[PDB]
RNA sequence: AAAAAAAAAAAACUAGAUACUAACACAUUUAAUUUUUUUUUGUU
């Protein structure tokens, strides 16, 4: 609802196409921070809603090291960037499980401690 | 024929009739800043 507020102003002025859009600030970014998730949505189900706008190559769900349950945020890289422009913009503020999730562009830095979780995820997304 | 040493209207209630006052106020108002509220939970 922070970002959703921008695009309405932006569009209203007829900004139209990325050169003048704030989405142009990125261009080298693909991963999207996916916030305010419900707790029971897992990687496969976050890999349901987000293929509407593109083809995901990677995904990471943030979850506590001990109990292994959702922190409530994920990082999902689309194959073709412009999906990011599309997902952030179009799907932000949308309800799943009662709570309206947040998306925004992100620069994502991998962490050693999950290293195996990368191949374990990749191998499934490497199937396609 | 005379001198008459100067004061009367109401009030209340309820409705109705009509003037009027106060340079009263009348389209601007939005670039620092508080309605910005949630069971904390956004990662070298």
From Swiss-Prot:
<dbReference type="GO" id="GO:0000349">
    <property type="term" value="P:generation of catalytic spliceosome for first transesterification step"/>
</dbReference>
<keyword id="KW-0694">RNA-binding</keyword>
<keyword id="KW-0963">Cytoplasm</keyword>
<dbReference type="GO" id="GO:0005737">
    <property type="term" value="C:cytoplasm"/>
</dbReference>
<dbReference type="GO" id="GO:0005634">
    <property type="term" value="C:nucleus"/>
</dbReference>
<keyword id="KW-0747">Spliceosome</keyword>
<dbReference type="GO" id="GO:0071011">
    <property type="term" value="C:precatalytic spliceosome"/>
</dbReference>
<dbReference type="GO" id="GO:0051237">
    <property type="term" value="P:maintenance of RNA location"/>
</dbReference>
<dbReference type="InterPro" id="IPR051847">
    <property type="entry name" value="RNA_proc/Spliceosome_comp"/>
</dbReference>
<dbReference type="GO" id="GO:0005686">
    <property type="term" value="C:U2 snRNP"/>
</dbReference>
<keyword id="KW-0507">mRNA processing</keyword>
<dbReference type="GO" id="GO:0000974">
    <property type="term" value="C:Prp19 complex"/>
</dbReference>
<comment type="function">
    <text>Required for pre-mRNA splicing and spliceosome assembly. As part of the pre-mRNA retention and splicing (RES) complex, required for nuclear pre-mRNA retention and efficient splicing. Required for MER1-activated splicing.</text>
</comment>
<dbReference type="InterPro" id="IPR000504">
    <property type="entry name" value="RRM_dom"/>
</dbReference>
<dbReference type="GO" id="GO:0006406">
    <property type="term" value="P:mRNA export from nucleus"/>
</dbReference>
<dbReference type="InterPro" id="IPR045844">
    <property type="entry name" value="RRM_Ist3-like"/>
</dbReference>
<dbReference type="GO" id="GO:0003723">
    <property type="term" value="F:RNA binding"/>
</dbReference>
<dbReference type="InterPro" id="IPR012677">
    <property type="entry name" value="Nucleotide-bd_a/b_plait_sf"/>
</dbReference>
<dbReference type="InterPro" id="IPR035979">
    <property type="entry name" value="RBD_domain_sf"/>
</dbReference>
<keyword id="KW-0539">Nucleus</keyword>
<dbReference type="GO" id="GO:0005681">
    <property type="term" value="C:spliceosomal complex"/>
</dbReference>
<comment type="similarity">
    <text>Belongs to the IST3 family.</text>
</comment>
<keyword id="KW-0508">mRNA splicing</keyword>
<dbReference type="GO" id="GO:1903241">
    <property type="term" value="P:U2-type prespliceosome assembly"/>
</dbReference>
<dbReference type="GO" id="GO:0000245">
    <property type="term" value="P:spliceosomal complex assembly"/>
</dbReference>
<comment type="subunit">
    <text>Component of the 45S U1.U2.U4/U6.U5 penta-snRNP particle, a subcomplex of the spliceosome. Belongs to the CWC complex (or CEF1-associated complex), a spliceosome sub-complex reminiscent of a late-stage spliceosome composed of the U2, U5 and U6 snRNAs and at least BUD13, BUD31, BRR2, CDC40, CEF1, CLF1, CUS1, CWC2, CWC15, CWC21, CWC22, CWC23, CWC24, CWC25, CWC27, ECM2, HSH155, IST3, ISY1, LEA1, MSL1, NTC20, PRP8, PRP9, PRP11, PRP19, PRP21, PRP22, PRP45, PRP46, SLU7, SMB1, SMD1, SMD2, SMD3, SMX2, SMX3, SNT309, SNU114, SPP2, SYF1, SYF2, RSE1 and YJU2.</text>
</comment>
<protein>
    <recommendedName>
        <fullName>U2 snRNP component IST3</fullName>
    </recommendedName>
</protein>
<dbReference type="Pfam" id="PF00076">
    <property type="entry name" value="RRM_1"/>
</dbReference>
<feature type="domain" description="RRM">
    <location>
        <begin position="30"/>
        <end position="108"/>
    </location>
</feature>
<dbReference type="GO" id="GO:0070274">
    <property type="term" value="C:RES complex"/>
</dbReference>
<dbReference type="GO" id="GO:0000398">
    <property type="term" value="P:mRNA splicing, via spliceosome"/>
</dbReference>
